[PDB]
């Protein structure tokens, strides 16, 4: 069996064997998860390897490499370069981005990252367009669907984002002071029917190759640079999903802040939708293969559908990150405790509003303005 | 080793039937040029084989065999039994149904087939449910999507049903007397935008394993029996598609008839929707895996979505069959010529109305009553 877990030594040996170094090197394992090692080798390099836990298939490393390379074809400046990949060893050798900070960390420290939304909006519009039926011959697209089928990672999302938070399930994790509001959600038939439909779309709508986990902890940032990483959840899913999960995580950071310190984030939500729409639209007009593409009003109705699902998926992400298994540092580190519970209540209520009202919003401004009203 | 595909003849077809262990006479009775259908007698047997030669791979035989077997697990009384299949030779050995008549032929001859809609409604509700995410564990369903990926047959449909009739494309085929009305369709931006969305759903909504070409020429019928055949177009697609294609073909036959003779067809349109809804609903109650399934109103909204798409897909089928490459004998055999033109103009008009107004109908009766008024 060809798979063997690497260490700092064999990681160095792999790097030299690839001719990526002469080589005089030091290696430190710097990963923060329990299912991947990330080896930093210092010119520098990163080698990421999936571990079986021996649980989750090491096949996600094939998806991740393939996803990163595909993203690199259209937005090379917004993803790490890949130098080597191997499915059997479950390895991706890629560009070192140690000079950057994970965006969630920076944002909690109070960095504002002026270009974050412009860069992520571009990432969203080009990646989501160029792997769609709008951009690709349909027989080609259908092969990519097979190639990026991701049953085990999709299973995590289907459960965590779309199901468990809405019921009294074992995976949930919330303070007992939130229970009155949590049980309010559980008893809300109409929001749950809506969460069901959004889930159905997640299950069935193979529109493009999505990132599948595009939150602020999956992005590197500094003043001038942005890089998206860790596309292990990539599969063919709804266009609105990456847009919505990103947006929710900007709202999650706003909720961790107070007063006028929230404005940079509200500005990020506006600018990211704006940039997504502009970017998707330029691509659509330049590169669409569809005979229907140029019919007046078709791009518009298409964007309206993506906008609506995006808001619904943001609602689920807001709710999921508050009371489910996998939380965010933005909410969990708010102090004092009573203030934390207050803001977590607001994440629940705004997420609910987003799900229920998603088709009523006409612009991103309506979304921002409604959120601001609720969180006053 | 070597390539194993070889075209069968009447002799080698008999030799295979005996080698399988299943004094004989053989006649090839196929009506297309892409398949041979060998009838073997004395008890009887059918052997279908794909021909390589619209050039089309023999891979469709693999789809068809596996689609037939899957349909048979839930509705064995509504599909021919499969005794043997082989992907390399591209053969399906199946139950003889020569005591039955192709439904389109029988309907044009004036057969009414009292149970046709009862039987097709059940086929529709059970096949479409039990292969969906509602019925299957999502990891299981996702592998069935790979297995029934059908790029070439889908390409036919995406072109013929959803694209070509709506523009001045070379595949179209209509009398020059229809041109004023045909060009009216081509210039209709708002209906084309809706055809585009219906297509997008065909391209992207992997909800269930559908038959993909369920018209009246794909069904065997007698007074007491119904059998669905030729699921070569099978893939993971929108639930409403089979429902809508079938419905459109009942309306196509109605248009070929006059006056009081149309009523058994209108009753079939009503009964097939009713029975589909009943059958799908019973299945939903008894066999859903979804925690969301029994939330009051969710089955209802789900059926409303299927109903809407089904009417829009019916619109496309009505138009497609009238002016596209592949016509229907119901319309093309209408006499005299001017009557044929009149009825073909109405198929275009009702199809357009179906596409445009699909979300405004509340019941199947609404659909039947609008059709009746348009074809007075
Ligand atoms: C006039 C007959 C009544 C038959 C009867 O009484 N037999 C019926 C029953 C169903 C009705 C249509 C649907 O409602 C959808 C739609 C609703 C809009 O509002 C107005 C237009 C439209 C096309 C309706 C027109 C008309 O109203 C219909 C054909
Ligand atoms: N290309 C890289 N350059 C520098 N550090 C990286 C790089 N990729 C990952 N890391 C570090 O390792 C951590 C975990 O990486 P990630 O790809 O998210 O692994 P996991 O999928 O296990 O979460 C990141 O937060 C980051 O600090
Ligand atoms: N199981 C069967 N029993 C009896 N006749 C059959 C059977 N299957 C097909 N046929 C006959 O052969 C014709 C062609 O079958 P079909 O499966 O529709 O092939 P094609 O894909 O080439 O149209 C049918 O219209 C029918 O007359
Ligand atoms: Ho990560
Ligand atoms: Ho990851
Ligand atoms: Ho056929
Ligand atoms: Ho066929």
UniProtKB/Swiss-Prot annotation, chain A:
Pathway: Amino-acid biosynthesis; L-methionine biosynthesis via salvage pathway; S-methyl-5-thio-alpha-D-ribose 1-phosphate from S-methyl-5'-thioadenosine (hydrolase route): step 2/2. One of its GO terms (biological process) is L-methionine salvage from methylthioadenosine. ATP binds at residues 36, 48, 95-97, 230-232. InterPro entries: Aminoglycoside_PTrfase, Kinase-like_dom_sf, Methylthioribose_kinase. It comes from the Bacteria. It catalyses: 5-(methylsulfanyl)-D-ribose + ATP = 5-(methylsulfanyl)-alpha-D-ribose 1-phosphate + ADP + H(+). Keywords: Amino-acid biosynthesis, ATP-binding, Kinase, Methionine biosynthesis, Nucleotide-binding, Stress response, Transferase. Induction: By starvation. Homodimer. Catalyzes the phosphorylation of methylthioribose into methylthioribose-1-phosphate. This is Methylthioribose kinase. It comes from Bacillus subtilis (strain 168).
């Amino acid at each position: 069996p060809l798979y063997e877990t690497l260490n700092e030594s064999s990681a160095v040996a792999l790097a030299v064997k690839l001719g990526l170094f002469p080589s005089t090197l030091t290696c430190q394992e710097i990963g923060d998860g329990n299912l991947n090692y990330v080896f930093h080798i210092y010119r520098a390099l990163i080698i990421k390897q999936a571990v079986p836990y021996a649980p989750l298939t090491i096949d996600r490393a094939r998806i991740e490499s393939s996803a990163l390379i595909r993203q690199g074809e259209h937005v090379p400046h917004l993803v790490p370069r890949v130098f080597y990949s191997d499915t059997e060893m479950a390895v991706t050798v890629m560009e070192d981005l140690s000079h950057l900070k994970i965006a969630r960390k920076g944002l909690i420290e109070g960095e504002n990252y002026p270009h974050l939304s412009q860069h992520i909006g571009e990432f969203l519009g080009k990646t989501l367009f160029y792997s769609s039926d709008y951009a690709l011959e349909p027989k080609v697209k259908k092969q990519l669907v097979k190639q990026f089928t991701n049953p085990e990672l999709c299973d995590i999302t289907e459960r965590l984002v779309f199901t468990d938070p809405f019921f009294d399930h074992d995976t949930n994790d919330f303070e007992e002071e939130l229970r009155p509001f949590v049980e309010k959600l559980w008893n809300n038939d109409s929001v749950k029917i809506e969460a069901a439909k959004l889930k159905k779309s997640f299950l069935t709508s193979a529109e493009t190759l999505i990132h599948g986990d595009l939150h602020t902890g999956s992005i590197f940032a500094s003043e001038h640079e942005t890089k998206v990483i860790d596309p292990e959840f990539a599969f063919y899913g709804p266009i609105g999903f990456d847009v919505g999960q990103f947006i929710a995580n900007l709202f999650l950071n706003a909720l961790s802040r107070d007063g006028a310190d929230r404005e940079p984030l509200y500005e990020h939500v506006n600018q990211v939708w704006e940039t997504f729409e502009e970017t998707f639209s330029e691509a659509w007009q330049k590169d669409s293969l569809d005979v229907y593409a140029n019919i007046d009003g078709y791009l518009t109705d298409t964007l309206s559908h993506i906008f609506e699902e995006a808001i619904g998926f943001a609602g689920c992400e807001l709710i999921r990150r508050t009371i489910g298994l996998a939380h965010v540092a933005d909410l969990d580190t708010i102090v004092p405790f009573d203030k934390r519970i207050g803001r977590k209540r607001l994440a629940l209520e705004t997420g609910t509003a987003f799900i229920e009202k998603r088709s009523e919003f006409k612009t991103i401004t309506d979304v921002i303005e409604l959120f601001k009203l609720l969180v006053k």
